[PDB]
Scaffold this active site. Sequence first.
Site, PDB file in Angstrom:
ATOM      1  N   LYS A  34       5.742  -6.256  13.592  1.00 21.44           N
ATOM      2  CA  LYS A  34       7.064  -5.924  13.078  1.00 21.44           C
ATOM      3  C   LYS A  34       7.944  -5.514  14.252  1.00 21.44           C
ATOM      4  O   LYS A  34       7.680  -4.511  14.915  1.00 21.44           O
ATOM      5  CB  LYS A  34       6.981  -4.790  12.056  1.00 21.44           C
ATOM      6  CG  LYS A  34       8.350  -4.570  11.382  1.00 21.44           C
ATOM      7  CD  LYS A  34       8.325  -3.380  10.435  1.00 21.44           C
ATOM      8  CE  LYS A  34       9.688  -3.237   9.761  1.00 21.44           C
ATOM      9  NZ  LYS A  34       9.865  -1.862   9.160  1.00 21.44           N
ATOM     10  N   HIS A  49       7.996   8.645   6.744  1.00 19.40           N
ATOM     11  CA  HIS A  49       6.915   7.932   6.057  1.00 19.40           C
ATOM     12  C   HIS A  49       5.619   8.061   6.817  1.00 19.40           C
ATOM     13  O   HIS A  49       5.602   8.543   7.953  1.00 19.40           O
ATOM     14  CB  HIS A  49       7.245   6.424   6.006  1.00 19.40           C
ATOM     15  CG  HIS A  49       7.198   5.749   7.354  1.00 19.40           C
ATOM     16  ND1 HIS A  49       8.212   5.862   8.282  1.00 19.40           N
ATOM     17  CD2 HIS A  49       6.218   5.034   7.962  1.00 19.40           C
ATOM     18  CE1 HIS A  49       7.861   5.259   9.406  1.00 19.40           C
ATOM     19  NE2 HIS A  49       6.652   4.746   9.236  1.00 19.40           N
TER      20      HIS A  49
HETATM   21  O1  LIG Z   1       7.190  -4.201   2.916  1.00 21.25           O
HETATM   22  C1  LIG Z   1       6.120  -3.590   3.221  1.00 21.25           C
HETATM   23  C2  LIG Z   1       4.891  -4.290   3.587  1.00 21.25           C
HETATM   24  C3  LIG Z   1       4.808  -5.706   3.622  1.00 21.25           C
HETATM   25  O2  LIG Z   1       5.897  -6.432   3.278  1.00 21.25           O
HETATM   26  C4  LIG Z   1       3.648  -6.370   4.027  1.00 21.25           C
HETATM   27  C5  LIG Z   1       2.500  -5.602   4.382  1.00 21.25           C
HETATM   28  O3  LIG Z   1       1.391  -6.289   4.787  1.00 21.25           O
HETATM   29  C6  LIG Z   1       2.501  -4.198   4.305  1.00 21.25           C
HETATM   30  C7  LIG Z   1       3.686  -3.536   3.899  1.00 21.25           C
HETATM   31  O4  LIG Z   1       3.667  -2.150   3.809  1.00 21.25           O
HETATM   32  C8  LIG Z   1       4.734  -1.525   3.005  1.00 21.25           C
HETATM   33  C9  LIG Z   1       4.661  -0.028   3.086  1.00 21.25           C
HETATM   34  C10 LIG Z   1       5.005   0.782   1.989  1.00 21.25           C
HETATM   35  C11 LIG Z   1       4.978   2.187   2.081  1.00 21.25           C
HETATM   36  C12 LIG Z   1       4.591   2.786   3.291  1.00 21.25           C
HETATM   37  O5  LIG Z   1       4.557   4.148   3.453  1.00 21.25           O
HETATM   38  C13 LIG Z   1       4.238   1.972   4.388  1.00 21.25           C
HETATM   39  O6  LIG Z   1       3.856   2.537   5.565  1.00 21.25           O
HETATM   40  C14 LIG Z   1       4.275   0.588   4.285  1.00 21.25           C
HETATM   41  C15 LIG Z   1       6.105  -2.078   3.277  1.00 21.25           C
HETATM   42  O7  LIG Z   1       7.191  -1.455   2.586  1.00 21.25           O
HETATM   43  O1  LIG Z   2       5.519   0.918   8.135  1.00 14.88           O
HETATM   44  C1  LIG Z   2       5.295  -0.280   7.796  1.00 14.88           C
HETATM   45  C2  LIG Z   2       6.404  -1.169   7.481  1.00 14.88           C
HETATM   46  O2  LIG Z   2       7.671  -0.695   7.671  1.00 14.88           O
HETATM   47  C3  LIG Z   2       6.184  -2.482   7.124  1.00 14.88           C
HETATM   48  C4  LIG Z   2       7.168  -3.492   6.679  1.00 14.88           C
HETATM   49  C5  LIG Z   2       6.792  -4.861   6.515  1.00 14.88           C
HETATM   50  C6  LIG Z   2       7.711  -5.804   5.980  1.00 14.88           C
HETATM   51  C7  LIG Z   2       8.975  -5.369   5.587  1.00 14.88           C
HETATM   52  O3  LIG Z   2       9.851  -6.237   5.070  1.00 14.88           O
HETATM   53  C8  LIG Z   2       9.344  -4.048   5.712  1.00 14.88           C
HETATM   54  O4  LIG Z   2      10.584  -3.759   5.210  1.00 14.88           O
HETATM   55  C9  LIG Z   2       8.481  -3.100   6.254  1.00 14.88           C
HETATM   56  O5  LIG Z   2       4.875  -2.967   7.052  1.00 14.88           O
HETATM   57  C10 LIG Z   2       3.761  -2.160   7.341  1.00 14.88           C
HETATM   58  C11 LIG Z   2       2.484  -2.741   7.241  1.00 14.88           C
HETATM   59  C12 LIG Z   2       1.364  -1.901   7.510  1.00 14.88           C
HETATM   60  O6  LIG Z   2       0.129  -2.449   7.413  1.00 14.88           O
HETATM   61  C13 LIG Z   2       1.528  -0.531   7.864  1.00 14.88           C
HETATM   62  C14 LIG Z   2       2.782  -0.006   7.958  1.00 14.88           C
HETATM   63  O7  LIG Z   2       2.960   1.282   8.293  1.00 14.88           O
HETATM   64  C15 LIG Z   2       3.966  -0.817   7.700  1.00 14.88           C
HETATM   65 FE   LIG Z   3       5.577   3.861  11.053  1.00 15.20          FE
END
Ligand SMILES: O=C1c2c(O)cc(O)cc2O[C@@H](c2ccc(O)c(O)c2)[C@@H]1O
Ligand SMILES: O=c1c(O)c(-c2ccc(O)c(O)c2)oc2cc(O)cc(O)c12
Ligand SMILES: [Fe+2]
Length: 349
Positions: free
Chosen positions: A212, A231
């Site tokens: 990311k 978070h």
């Molecule tokens: O979009 C998200 C996301 C994703 O798209 C793909 C993936 O593989 C993991 C993800 O993780 C989500 C998430 C939610 C709450 C948290 O506190 C956090 O750390 C991460 C995130 O929002």
């Molecule tokens: O903190 C995290 C996070 O922000 C996102 C994320 C991915 C796609 C999105 O579109 C987005 O808005 C956020 O993925 C994660 C995946 C993990 O395994 C652990 C994480 O901590 C995050």
């Molecule tokens: Fe983080």
Amino acid sequence: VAVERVESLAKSGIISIPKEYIRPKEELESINDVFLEEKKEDGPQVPTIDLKNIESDDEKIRENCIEELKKASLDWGVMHLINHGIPADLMERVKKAGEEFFSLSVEEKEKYANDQATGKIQGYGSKLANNASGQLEWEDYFFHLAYPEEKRDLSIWPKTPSDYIEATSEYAKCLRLLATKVFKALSVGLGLEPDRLEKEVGGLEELLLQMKINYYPKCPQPELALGVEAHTDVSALTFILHNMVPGLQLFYEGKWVTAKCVPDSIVMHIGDTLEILSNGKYKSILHRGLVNKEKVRISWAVFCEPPKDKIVLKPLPEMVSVESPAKFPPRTFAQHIEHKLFGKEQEEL
Ligand SMILES: O=C1c2c(O)cc(O)cc2O[C@@H](c2ccc(O)c(O)c2)[C@@H]1O
Ligand SMILES: O=c1c(O)c(-c2ccc(O)c(O)c2)oc2cc(O)cc(O)c12
Ligand SMILES: [Fe+2]
């Protein structure tokens, strides 16, 4: 629907930020100037953990390294890793490539836009409001699976710069080797067999590394917004590179601590997945990111995740007893994410 990127908004000529970006009154009190905060050297500080001897033939020295890593993980759950084994020039190449991709116009980047409505979660995006609050954060990002190689969708990866795929691929492979080293040392720290924790999160075959790239445009009222909300990471481990603009803060002992920029290091977070498996021993720390009006901040976070549905995460038997009850109920990684999102949605409702 409208597609609004924060980079577009930052360049639109606004004087004040839109209301959706202003944090609640109670949260504004803890937000200060990131540059003034980074200069402060009083109070607890994020630990720097030297991994040089993590696999040394010299037992006393190896054990000392494992103990320092263990201690930082039980206390902070976050640290600046040095002598981690990832070549410094490879990391500079990865960052340069990310900077170049983000320097393209928003219009060029939209060719990589994600599409959550059809399940296309990889690509260029900005967080859509997902609860009654309507709260938005000051960042755009690019998200894609980076490892294992057979699971990648190379078609969604940046084609400009020409070396994005080469650089990012090598970096992910290097991080995968470092994750193994860490998992082993953390397993030994809990008194488990060295290969235990990595096996529990999927092993070579199922553990996923997600990249990311976080892009934080300059903000005209940085004291009112957050680049990323408070978070905890849901991953097993997270490894992050930064472009030396401060922004990461950690909630330690009830106070927001600002991370200092330690050259050549890699920030590593213990994530919820390891906290759950270790029954609360290793800590997944609450953290957030500040924006500023002087410099664009960029970070590269690689999340090491267990398979989303195939593994039910819960405290390991060895970590649970009559005297040490389980601090978490069992959930798959997907269910855990949903529960955190659900609790927030109910909260804002
Ligand atoms: O979009 C998200 C996301 C994703 O798209 C793909 C993936 O593989 C993991 C993800 O993780 C989500 C998430 C939610 C709450 C948290 O506190 C956090 O750390 C991460 C995130 O929002
Ligand atoms: O903190 C995290 C996070 O922000 C996102 C994320 C991915 C796609 C999105 O579109 C987005 O808005 C956020 O993925 C994660 C995946 C993990 O395994 C652990 C994480 O901590 C995050
Ligand atoms: Fe983080």
